[PDB]
Amino acid sequence: DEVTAELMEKAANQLFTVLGELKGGAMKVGQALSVMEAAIPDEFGEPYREALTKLQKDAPPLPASKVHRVLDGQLGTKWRERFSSFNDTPVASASIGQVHKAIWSDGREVAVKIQYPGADEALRADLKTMQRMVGVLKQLSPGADVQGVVDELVERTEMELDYRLEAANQRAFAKAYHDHPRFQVPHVVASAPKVVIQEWIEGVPMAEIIRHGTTEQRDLIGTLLAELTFDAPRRLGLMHGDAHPGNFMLLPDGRMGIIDFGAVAPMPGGFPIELGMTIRLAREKNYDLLLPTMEKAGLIQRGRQVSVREIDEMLRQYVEPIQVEVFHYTRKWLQKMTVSQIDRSVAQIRTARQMDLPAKLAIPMRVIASVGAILCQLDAHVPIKALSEELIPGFAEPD
Ligand SMILES: Nc1ncnc2c1ncn2[C@@H]1O[C@H](COP(=O)(O)OP(=O)(O)O)[C@@H](O)[C@H]1O
């Protein structure tokens, strides 16, 4: 079964590659590769290689010496004076680094994330190569759509390489949720490009609860995640962003610990009222008001004949959970949500779905999808109706 997971991963990557070919590159990846190899000097090949195998140089956990060297580079050669103690043996792995447990000079236990020394050069060389390739596509692939791709690559790369960015996001959240009854965000103790230090917290990882959690653990951490999702933009005008179980844990006192803030998305105006409004109107099947609301919001394409059945299908995954007091998010239900209402053999229609959502709607809907999927993995019972009434603008009965 370990095989099947990787097979699914491979299938997903294949699909997204095909998506890139059809919606972006305007040619197959192999053909594009031939063009790129012709259109990019071989002289740029060997540096790109040499930039990439220092990262290959110490693949397993870094020996103490190299750890201390990174610390030298980021906090100075006297970095030890800032600690009470430091464990040379890493306790966890990060995407491009490793995490150590230590004790800060004030006596607080801390997690210290140390970036691999060869990560910066490698990732930036990779970025350069992909920039060149985008150039090749833009100039030589007829009908290619590479709009905004370079910017996305640069932004992603910088978010991975400069720890201070995520550190700043985390500071915002740590300030907002200090002494909160249900959420715990560790404070940032120190931040540098390649080293970031924060208060140590540990509980039961959400992944562990997904695998072997009790019903009560599942329900609780699920309900907490759901709450955070709508509370954060209301509280500090920010959304925690696309969720992953690795970001969260259940603490002994029943609070949810949150440790990853690399996907924080800006929402200055809070959650758009159009969303909650749309869900309420859809529950009531008030299509007369629902369709103009969705069109104005940009949730459906303007000036199109739309199918009410398709609208119902479109909003089903949002409507069904709030039709009950406590909804049981399950994989079974989520699977039912993928079963299309309209067979293409019955009727050939173009979808009413907006494939170019406004940003203000696109971001929260994406995060909500990720969260919902996680709730289904958790098999969590969640009072999403009440949470929506209290936290989501426009959802409660407007009387
Ligand atoms: N504040 C913290 N307290 C305890 N452990 C932490 C803390 N921050 C990170 N970790 C450990 O580090 C691991 C990865 O950290 P993470 O923030 O996900 O790094 P990255 O996002 O770069 O992968 C986590 O699985 C967790 O066990």
Distance, CA of 82 to CA of 124 (rounded, Å):
30
Secondary structure class of 130 (helix, strand, coil): helix
Phi, psi at 91, each rounded to 5°: -105, -15
Distance, CA of 16 to CA of 14 (rounded, Å):
5
Would the CB of 76 count as within 6 Å of ligand 1?
A: no
**Is residue 305 packed enough to be buried (19+ CB in 10 Å), middle (13-18) or exposed (0-12)?**
exposed
Would the CB of 395 count as within 6 Å of ligand 1?
A: no
Nearest ligand 1 atom to alpha carbon 201: 3
Taking domain 64-118+162-197, whether its CATH number is 3.30.200 is answered by: yes
- Using alpha carbons, list the distances in angstroms from residue 267 to 239, 343, 363: 6, 37, 9
Cβ(327)–Cβ(283) under 8 Å? Answer: no
Structure tokens at 233: 């933009």
Structure tokens at 90: 């890493």
Would the CB of 246 count as within 6 Å of ligand 1?
A: yes
Ligand 1 atom 14 nearest Cα: 94
Backbone CA torsion sign across 96, 169, 182, 398: negative
b/e string for 16-36 if b means 16 or more Cβ within 10 A? eeeeebeebbbbeeeebeebb
Instruction: Choose one of 100, 110, 113 to mutate for the ligand 1 pocket test, by most ligand atoms within 8 angstroms of C-beta.
Output: 113
Question: Any long-range contacts for 184-187 (C-beta under 8 Å, 24+ apart)?
Answer: 184/251, 184/255, 184/256, 184/257, 184/258, 185/257, 185/258, 186/111, 186/257, 186/259
Query: Which residues does 65 contact at the CB level (< 8 Å), separation at least 6?
Result: none
Q: Hey, where are the domains in the chain?
A: 2-51+123-160, 64-118+162-197, 203-399
Residues in the chain: 399
Structure tokens at 157: 């790369």
Query: How many angstroms is it from 332 CA to the middle of ligand 1?
Result: 31
Structure tokens at 180: 């909160």
Phi, psi at 233, each rounded to 5°: -70, -25
Secondary structure class of 238 (helix, strand, coil): strand
Distance, CA of 244 to CA of 279 (rounded, Å):
25
Taking the CA atoms of residue 276, residue 280, residue 283 and residue 285 in that order, the dihedral angle to the nearest 10 degrees is -120
Nearest ligand 1 atom to alpha carbon 186: 1
Secondary structure class of 62 (helix, strand, coil): coil
* 336 known member of a binding site: no
Distance, CA of 170 to CA of 151 (rounded, Å):
23
Would the CB of 186 count as within 6 Å of ligand 1?
A: yes
Cβ(357)–Cβ(294) under 8 Å? Answer: no
Among all chains, which residue has been given the structure tokens 């199918």? 307
Would the CB of 201 count as within 6 Å of ligand 1?
A: yes
Q: What is the DSSP string of 157-213?
A: HHHHH-HHHHHHHHHHHHHHTTT-SSEE-PPEEEE-SSEEEEE----EEHHHHHHH-
* 345 known member of a binding site: no
* 325 known member of a binding site: no
Distance, CA of 98 to CA of 112 (rounded, Å):
8
β-strand pairing of 327-328 with 381-382? antiparallel
Backbone CA torsion sign across 140, 141, 147, 148: negative
Instruction: Choose one of 93, 96, 99 to mutate for the ligand 1 pocket test, by most ligand atoms within 8 angstroms of C-beta.
Output: 99
Would the CB of 203 count as within 6 Å of ligand 1?
A: no
Among all chains, which residue has been given the structure tokens 């491009």? 96
Distance, CA of 99 to CA of 91 (rounded, Å):
6
Distance, CA of 176 to CA of 193 (rounded, Å):
24
Question: Any long-range contacts for 208-214 (C-beta under 8 Å, 24+ apart)?
Answer: 209/250, 209/378, 210/245, 210/377, 210/378, 213/378
Distance, CA of 113 to CA of 94 (rounded, Å):
8
* 285 known member of a binding site: no
Give all strands (DSSP E) within the chain, no chain letters.
83-86, 92-94, 97-104, 109-115, 183-184, 188-191, 195-199, 204-205, 238-239, 248-250, 256-258, 265-266, 327-328, 381-382
Structure tokens at 340: 């299309």
